[PDB]
Symmetry: C4
Subunit: 25 residues, 4 copies
Amino acid sequence: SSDPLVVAASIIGILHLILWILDRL
Amino acid sequence: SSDPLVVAASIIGILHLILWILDRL
Amino acid sequence: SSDPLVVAASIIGILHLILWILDRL
Amino acid sequence: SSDPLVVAASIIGILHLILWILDRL
Ligand SMILES: CCCCCCCC/C=C/CCCCCCCC(=O)OC[C@@H](O)CO
Ligand SMILES: CCCCCCCC/C=C/CCCCCCCC(=O)OC[C@@H](O)CO
Ligand SMILES: CCCCCCCC/C=C/CCCCCCCC(=O)OC[C@@H](O)CO
Ligand SMILES: CCCCCCCC/C=C/CCCCCCCC(=O)OC[C@@H](O)CO
Ligand SMILES: [Ca+2]
Ligand SMILES: [Ca+2]
Ligand SMILES: [Ca+2]
Ligand SMILES: [Ca+2]
Ligand SMILES: [Ca+2]
Ligand SMILES: [Cl-]
């Protein structure tokens, strides 16, 4: 388990990646 | 909970995101 | 130890870095 | 505390940031 702030940051980072890929495609 | 260095990195990453968005807007 | 979602995000981030470097080289 | 892989990723991310800033300055 991780600090909730670290979980939140990981979620935001993954979604940032996903949105960038979808934008480029 | 997380290593303090990982918490710090998550904070910096989130703030980096926020600043980028504000700059673009 | 960390939340599995945080481990996954860290792996994805490292691989993202690696792929970017290989692309540029 | 965090998984060692997550600590490593956080270190790499911070250093990536630092190098980018120094390059731009
Ligand atoms: C990038 C596409 C998605 C939009 C993302 C835009 C950025 C939004 C960022 C929001 C930050 C919310 C983070 C919320 C973090 C909450 C921290 C908390 O309540 O617990 C503190 C712990 O440290 C105590 O153990
Ligand atoms: C990007 C906009 C905001 C400016 C950010 C610029 C980058 C600044 C980076 C500073 C790095 C500070 C990290 C500080 C990390 C401290 C680590 C610590 O004291 O505990 C070590 C643990 O591993 C032991 O359990
Ligand atoms: C960027 C080059 C590599 C391609 C990456 C493309 C992005 C793929 C992202 C996939 C996200 C998979 C994350 C999978 C995360 C699973 C979370 C889980 O099962 O446990 C939940 C815990 O919170 C409970 O403790
Ligand atoms: C970007 C400027 C700095 C150069 C960075 C270039 C990228 C180098 C990346 C290297 C990845 C090394 C990560 C090393 C991670 C080791 C994982 C480990 O041994 O423990 C596994 C745990 O999950 C078990 O609990
Ligand atoms: Ca906390
Ligand atoms: Ca430590
Ligand atoms: Ca969990
Ligand atoms: Ca932990
Ligand atoms: Ca492990
Ligand atoms: Cl963590």
